Amino acid sequence: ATVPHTMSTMKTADNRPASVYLKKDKPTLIKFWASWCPLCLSELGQAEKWAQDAKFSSANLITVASPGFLHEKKDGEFQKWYAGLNYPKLPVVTDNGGTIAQNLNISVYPSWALIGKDGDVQRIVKGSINEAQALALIRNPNADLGSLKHS
Numbered sequence: 001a002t003v004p005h006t007m008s009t010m011k012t013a014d015n016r017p018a019s020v021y022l023k024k025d026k027p028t029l030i031k032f033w034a035s036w037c038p039l040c041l042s043e044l045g046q047a048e049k050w051a052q053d054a055k056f057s058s059a060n061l062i063t064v065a066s067p068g069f070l071h072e073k074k075d076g077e078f079q080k081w082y083a084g085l086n087y088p089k090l091p092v093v094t095d096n097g098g099t100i101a102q103n104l105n106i107s108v109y110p111s112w113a114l115i116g117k118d119g120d121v122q123r124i125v126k127g128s129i130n131e132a133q134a135l136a137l138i139r140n141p142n143a144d145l146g147s148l149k150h151s
Helices: 003-007 038-042 046-053 077-082 099-103 130-141
Strands: 029-030 060-065 092-093 111-115 121-126
Touching: 003 099, 003 111, 029 130, 038 046, 046 060, 046 130, 077 092, 099 111, 111 130, 121 130
Parallel strands: 029 060, 060 092
Antiparallel strands: 029 111, 111 121
């Protein structure tokens, strides 16, 4: 199954269907993270800004937390913890057991994946990316991100 097909059986942290975020004819930029990673937590406000920014409007920007996977809080526990944080414009898909992360061989956080508009995985990046690297990826999945590492 493609990533969007898999995700279309999933809810967000507020219980709505994840599928509402997966707009057609747009690539999807996905940030994988966990509650136990303080770098990831420090970057939630950043991702929320991007998701709301017109520069990112050509892509779907979503994040995935994976209850019960890699020592993430269990299903229910995760959402209760996350409800104390305040990022109301950030989509957080909850993938119980980390199905998509396992399919994509994601083992470190944060990591990012770029899914094409046809649902195919185009790029996986281990670790953090900056706003310029994220914009470069939504424009060209084969962008050279290293040339912007020290920007």
